[PDB]
Design a protein around this ligand. Sequence first.
Ligand SMILES: [Cl-]
Ligand SMILES: [Cl-]
Ligand SMILES: [Cl-]
Lengths: 470, 470, 470
Amino acid sequence: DATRISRSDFPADFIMGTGSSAYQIEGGARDGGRGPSIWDTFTHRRPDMIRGGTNGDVAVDSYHLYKEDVNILKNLGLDAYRFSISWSRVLPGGRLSGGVNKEGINYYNNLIDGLLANGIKPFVTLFHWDVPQALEDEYGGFLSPRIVDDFCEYAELCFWEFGDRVKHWMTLNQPWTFSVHGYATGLYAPGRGRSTGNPGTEPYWVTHHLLLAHAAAVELYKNKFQRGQEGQIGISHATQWMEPWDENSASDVEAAARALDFMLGWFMEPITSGDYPKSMKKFVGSRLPKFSPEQSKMLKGSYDFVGLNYYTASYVTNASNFSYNTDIHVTYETDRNGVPIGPQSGSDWLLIYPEGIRKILVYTKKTYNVPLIYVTENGVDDVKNTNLTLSEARKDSMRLKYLQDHIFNVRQAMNDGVNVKGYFAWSLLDNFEWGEGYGVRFGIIHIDYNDNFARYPKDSAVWLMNSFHK
Amino acid sequence: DATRISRSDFPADFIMGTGSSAYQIEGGARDGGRGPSIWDTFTHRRPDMIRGGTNGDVAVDSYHLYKEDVNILKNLGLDAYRFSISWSRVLPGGRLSGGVNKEGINYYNNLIDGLLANGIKPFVTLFHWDVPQALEDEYGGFLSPRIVDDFCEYAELCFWEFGDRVKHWMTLNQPWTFSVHGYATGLYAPGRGRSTGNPGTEPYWVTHHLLLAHAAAVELYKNKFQRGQEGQIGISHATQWMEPWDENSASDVEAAARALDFMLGWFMEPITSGDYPKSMKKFVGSRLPKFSPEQSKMLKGSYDFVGLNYYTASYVTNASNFSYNTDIHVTYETDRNGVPIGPQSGSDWLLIYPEGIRKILVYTKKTYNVPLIYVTENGVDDVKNTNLTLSEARKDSMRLKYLQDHIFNVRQAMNDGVNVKGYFAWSLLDNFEWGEGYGVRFGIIHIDYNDNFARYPKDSAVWLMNSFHK
Amino acid sequence: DATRISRSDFPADFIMGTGSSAYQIEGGARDGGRGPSIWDTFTHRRPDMIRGGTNGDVAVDSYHLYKEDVNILKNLGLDAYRFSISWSRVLPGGRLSGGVNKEGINYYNNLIDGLLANGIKPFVTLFHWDVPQALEDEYGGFLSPRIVDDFCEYAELCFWEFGDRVKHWMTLNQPWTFSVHGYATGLYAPGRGRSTGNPGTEPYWVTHHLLLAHAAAVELYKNKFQRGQEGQIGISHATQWMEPWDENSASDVEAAARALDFMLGWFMEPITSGDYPKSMKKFVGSRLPKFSPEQSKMLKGSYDFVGLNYYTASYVTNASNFSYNTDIHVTYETDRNGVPIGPQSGSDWLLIYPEGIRKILVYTKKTYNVPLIYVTENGVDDVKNTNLTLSEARKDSMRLKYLQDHIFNVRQAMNDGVNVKGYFAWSLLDNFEWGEGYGVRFGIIHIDYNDNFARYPKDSAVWLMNSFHK
Ligand SMILES: [Cl-]
Ligand SMILES: [Cl-]
Ligand SMILES: [Cl-]
């Protein structure tokens, strides 16, 4: 029974925490010497692209309120906290010649020491879509392959400064989303894809550059730091369970496996065997870059653990110039015969399907043979309602049930022999939600935008504390 | 012609200025020992009643940022600034026994010395709807005639603490809107009359108590302070020009006179003659309270000057249990034949009718014989649009035309013989617009809610500085 | 013999301590954003009701001087300190929508870390009569059963913020005195029942709501916090030993049982059996509210331990519109023949009867079967005398004898089989004594009201340190 699930259902080394990302929570966008990211420029030059015409300038000010956030995490009582570093905060010109920003570095050391002073293990993510505008304007950010070198300098800087305290690193979080919405749909920064953009090619380049960035940085950590710092490095991928519309149509079973390949295979096959997946080569063909064999040699096996981000699920079936969206040759369906795959959440794109996480997990271990996994994101948003008062606003029953159901399923995947080491809820705080602006609330901690971002736990947080404290 | 209007069109002693009110700009709702006002409880207990479900806990933070507001005022170059004191900031329990708050007194004293250091004359308003919650809760606030004594204590504090430097006082601003929307429509705080409220009776009592509070405070100033401090005291009234829908229908002409009577005569006749206006006794009859004869002697001529707030105008015609709304027996028309009385501002209720201000002024002078008038409010709101970048956003041509046409008409009124002494635009800053929340902008100074309320002048501010500097 | 009593007469796990309550010591009534409690309004609106016409605006200033109180506690050497949180300090509008006050939370967190730095265990009391004025004014406070929900929000805040370090909680202290003197005699705040009050009904409702607030808060702790924080929760009851005026009159014996029933059974039977005591239903009958059966299921056994506050004792005999006072049908006798039950303290209502505490303890164990008890209050007041210099003033032999005799009797009770876990003297400091104002001194630490509340130990403090140090 899911409602009874608690810490003692898990092995003792199991890790529990929460998560944020720098641009969604920090604010202090032009403070302490930070330079502009592509999200800074996107939200300020294309306000029409954001619900409310808002931006992350202040966000929820974890830049100035990080001490409260740490006190929150100490009360919450979980093992670990996952956050990301703002590239253009530590290097405002993105590359070394641009300046090294001591104040930015001091911020993260203050963050990291606060966490450890309180027994909370930091899990740090080098990159979460916030590309320094300077690198974007000079050579097209991740379009160009120069990005690998700059990224590598940025990475080395973080390892040298923080690697004595941070022992768990991730190069990238959710690169899929950065590629697709950055360059295919043009909904996220830099906002490209109808030169003005091209959903047929750019996404594939960008992803190509992301993966070399990731593999270069892991070679760096592994050759220069790991022996002396003794940490571990890995990466974090967007996932979504893909169900065959018709369990029978062996052709649907195929539209589903293809939908995987194009989402998760696109990143996981490279770091597994040094190459993209067949289906992708087949359907993309010559628009899809190749790896030199030293590149493959570098990618193949570039990680100590993998993190999976899981929210939702879908039915897949087959489809009927060029674009990533169409290259997949599938159609997405939400119901079989009038029945949705699961109930809606506050967000119409998000259907609740706890069994999906069990599946995605088992699939991953089976298809790619990963020996160590973390779930690095999993959570749900609140129904929008500016009408509720706080005692109402905080009873977040759906989220609570969502957490218990997904955590129960993770536990099942383990029984199936998937070696999962921890689970992190998304997100710690309500925060900036990219194109959605401040309207969507994923926090286990509630935030009051009308009164300096006062923070208050929701019942999910009290429940996490009480059920998983240690 | 209007666009050429400048300070040299007016006499040398004429005064130009801008204005705000405490709850709309201050924030710092619970800082520096402020107690809660009825606007605090309303916005927090009934967020459904506010666009966005927002409140003025932070507002545009003038509580902390006033040094900046003062600098803006010094740059703007106008003679004067009109602001109001938050009753429950200085007396957080509303009455003396509730505690005198030194820190809130220190705040206004800093504001005031700050303005005086810069050559800016302070015009101060004791009351702008922000009734101390403690008084509302103890005896129903302006429902009870207890309010007259408490209001007097409050006023005497202010004169004692500030009267050495403030020389221009106003007891109430726009009492009309308070009565009507507080007690007839129930749209504003305390949100009554949509016991529980009675649109037929409460508005008339509230208004009755407002006027006695005003007259008691004026007797107090004049008997106990005027000789030593040598200030001047007055009051500010909502007004709207009322136009006969059909200039020919002597019946329409009268509906228009009656509509004035119930808006402006309701407050003006008592301080002129000691009594309510004839038409209101007729149509409201026995539901309309009466003044003892010593009350009338206190009310009559209880002011050194009067201010009028003008925004818009209207066509009036005759109408075909009880409520203030129906007691007027008029109907409101904008169109005289699908021909609107004037164009829309960014608000559909505000229609631009510059000659309105000229007429209201001339009417007030003739009907009530006021020897000295200020226009204490006048302004317009920008079209909403979260899509513009600041360079576009600050180009506020409508407002700029609006100001010149209205200021031009004020000049006319002075030619017509009205003694107008000054004119304040509304408002200085974009701010909390009551039930409209933050979505409506009246400022000559733009505000960026996304970036700690950064202030930036709009072309109207620039124009006012350039044409009226001194 | 009593005078030789020392820590080595007790088991090793036995706990000694001292205590205060928030409104009696803190002061800082309007500092750090505290909101007003009913004791604030009562003392300020009805000063005639307080000896001297004084209030606890400053009290003995522990709000500012707590570092000093902490040092005193470290010097005193006892295991524990019992204090209470001021509801309206943490939530100045009493309910969440009223604002969460960080600064009041920071205050208790400093107090608490301060005590823990010094090896002193904090025992914390959520409620000690200081009802937020905002709640009293909105819906009559503990008159309404709304209070149960608000009280629960409050309690959950406290457990979330402090429960990582506070491991010993109490929901209410001395609810009896609150009901009776708040609502029957009208002597204490809110001062009712001497509408307007009704000694016949309100006390019974107040008490009814107190017990539901207590039981809701305990269910909350036990279901949402206990597992993660591992604390313990309980409650503290007023008690007085009731002695049969004539040991022979079986009728007197019963008046005594009935007098207990109406003081202690009134609170104790509900948390023991789910219901009021038999005798109270009989004599109060239909005026006594009833528990739905889920209420009784929540109440029954709703505590981890119970504390008893004992001061004095009394002889009871039978008595010959309605009020709590008369419903008891008993009369109180001190003299058994011009032979007083014991000598006077500095207060004529307090008569020294050490075996009282032994009997009350044994009775509680037998009648209600509590497995775990603390004596949470016990102390005596000095003879008034503004004539003594400090060297004389601090020689408090009566108190010192009083403590030894009572502590001796506690030891007896443990021989008699009662499981007493600790004992706290009352109070640490001389302080605000409610209707008695400052004229009455219960402190083991003297206070000099003439010289910023300088603290100085009295011989009893010295003795307690010397005999009970650890
Ligand atoms: Cl370089
Ligand atoms: Cl008073
Ligand atoms: Cl609430």
